[PDB]
UniProtKB/Swiss-Prot annotation, chain A:
Cellular localization per UniProt: Sarcoplasmic reticulum membrane
Name of the molecule in the record: Ryanodine receptor 2
Full-length numbering of the shown residues: 291 to 378 of 4966
Domain MIR: 1-49
Tissues with expression: Highly expressed in heart, lung, cerebellum and brain. Detected at lower levels in adrenal gland, stomach, thymus, esophagus and ovary.
Subunit annotation: Homotetramer. Can also form heterotetramers with RYR1 and RYR3. Interacts with CALM and S100A1; these interactions regulate channel activity. Identified in a complex composed of RYR2, FKBP1B, PKA catalytic subunit, PRKAR2A, AKAP6, and the protein phosphatases PP2A and PP1. Interacts directly with FKBP1B, PKA, PP1 and PP2A. Interacts with FKBP1A and FKBP1B; these interactions may stabilize the channel in its closed state and prevent Ca(2+) leaks. Interacts with SELENON. Identified in a complex, composed of FSD2, CMYA5 and RYR2.
Species the sequence originates in: Mus musculus (Mouse)
UniProtKB/Swiss-Prot annotation, chain B:
Similarity section: Belongs to the ryanodine receptor (TC 1.A.3.1) family. RYR2 subfamily.
Compartments it resides in: Sarcoplasmic reticulum membrane
Domain observations: The calcium release channel activity resides in the C-terminal region while the remaining part of the protein resides in the cytoplasm.
Gene inactivation effect: Embryonically lethal. Embryos die at about 10 dpc, due to defects in heart tube development. Cardiac myotubes display enlarged rough endoplasmic reticulum and cytoplasmic vesicles that contain high levels of Ca(2+).
Domain MIR as annotated: residue spans: 4-59, 66-111
Name of this protein: Ryanodine receptor 2
Species lineage: Eukaryota, Metazoa, Chordata, Craniata, Vertebrata
Organism of origin: Mus musculus (Mouse)
From Swiss-Prot, chain C:
Domain free text: The calcium release channel activity resides in the C-terminal region while the remaining part of the protein resides in the cytoplasm.
Gene for this chain: Ryr2
Family (UniProt): Belongs to the ryanodine receptor (TC 1.A.3.1) family. RYR2 subfamily.
Assembly information from the UniProt record: Homotetramer. Can also form heterotetramers with RYR1 and RYR3. Interacts with CALM and S100A1; these interactions regulate channel activity. Identified in a complex composed of RYR2, FKBP1B, PKA catalytic subunit, PRKAR2A, AKAP6, and the protein phosphatases PP2A and PP1. Interacts directly with FKBP1B, PKA, PP1 and PP2A. Interacts with FKBP1A and FKBP1B; these interactions may stabilize the channel in its closed state and prevent Ca(2+) leaks. Interacts with SELENON. Identified in a complex, composed of FSD2, CMYA5 and RYR2.
Gene source species: Mus musculus
Name of the molecule in the record: Ryanodine receptor 2
Tissue specificity as recorded in UniProt: Highly expressed in heart, lung, cerebellum and brain. Detected at lower levels in adrenal gland, stomach, thymus, esophagus and ovary.
Length: 84, 136, 48, 40
């Protein structure tokens, strides 16, 4: 938890971003950057090592637990806009 | 084989491009003419005994042969058949890896290991399909 | 001869007038240029 | 504190070369599906 990465859409080959208007858009490599394309997981919904070299209790298990993405630059949280 | 044996300078080395299983190895690559006398040993799965191996030599005089390759050590590579080093040429105002007698330094780095196993746990670079616990 | 050619290939400096990669490392162009120098001039290029 | 390179370990290759008078550090790369060569 708490590791910035950039999500790549594998098929289109375009990196996930979050534009200025607070809406997810993909981004070509030339446009992508650590400001937009930089996201990290969140164990709990709350906000609150740094050089992640030592291992120290491998956290994320596929299927069992759950996560929450955080655009670390904006600090926003993902939410499903349920449309009428 | 041996199984997680160590790595020594001067010993023959075999590489493998991971997801595309094309064993980069001693192949009869006589196609690149950016330098006009130079090879570009690329990717093809022809692991065939003698024409299967590059070879390490150290970067400079700090570590001789028989010593264990350590992390962060820059190195020198070479075929046995053509005996060209892994050259970093400059074809046309840009970079062009070739194979020539002008050597080049080639630094390695760690990514993972055999002990660094998932067994369901997450590892960086891995693809996935996201899931809601309720809505799937 | 093995070690000879091994050492030559590190530093093969038979540099004629002008060819690719090296100066020469090719016989016909350098030989013809030196024959232009040889026949109508003397050993030198500018000489009678 | 000491660790070596074993057989069967995932490595990536790197080099440093000048271009535009700027030390452009690179990594070896290859996509052996349509072009069997290597790029950086």
């Amino acid at each position: 938890w708490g590791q910035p990465f950039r999500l790549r859409h594998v098929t289109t080959g375009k990196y996930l971003s979050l534009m200025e208007d607070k809406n997810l858009l993909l981004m070509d490599k030339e446009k992508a950057d650590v400001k937009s394309t930089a996201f990290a997981f969140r164990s709990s919904k709350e906000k609150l090592r740094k050089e992640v070299d030592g291992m120290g209790t491998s956290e994320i298990k596929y299927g069992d637990s759950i996560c929450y993405i955080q655009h670390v630059d904006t600090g926003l949280w993902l939410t499903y806009q349920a449309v009428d | 084989g041996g199984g997680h044996r160590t790595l020594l300078y001067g010993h023959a080395i075999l590489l493998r491009h991971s997801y595309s299983g094309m064993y980069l190895c001693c192949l009869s690559t006589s196609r690149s003419s950016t330098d006009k006398l130079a090879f570009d040993v690329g990717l093809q799965e022809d692991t065939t005994g003698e024409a299967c191996w590059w070879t390490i030599h150290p970067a400079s005089k700090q570590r001789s042969e028989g010593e264990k390759v350590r992390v962060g050590d820059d190195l020198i590579l070479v075929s046995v058949s053509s005996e060209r080093y892994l050259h970093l040429s400059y074809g046309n105002s840009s970079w062009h890896v070739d194979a020539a007698f002008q050597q080049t330094l080639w630094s390695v780095a760690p990514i993972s290991s055999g002990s660094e196993a998932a067994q369901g746990y997450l590892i960086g670079g891995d693809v996935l399909r996201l899931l809601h616990g309720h809505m799937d | 001869a093995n070690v000879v050619v091994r050492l030559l290939i590190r530093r093969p400096e038979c540099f004629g007038p002008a060819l690719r990669g090296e100066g020469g490392n090719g016989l016909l162009a350098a030989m013809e240029e030196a024959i232009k120098i040889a026949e109508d001039p003397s050993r030198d290029g500018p000489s009678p | 504190e000491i660790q070596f390179l074993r057989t069967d370990d995932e490595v990536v290759l790197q080099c440093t070369a000048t271009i535009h008078k700027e030390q452009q550090k690179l990594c070896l790369a290859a996509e052996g599906f349509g072009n069997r060569l290597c790029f950086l």
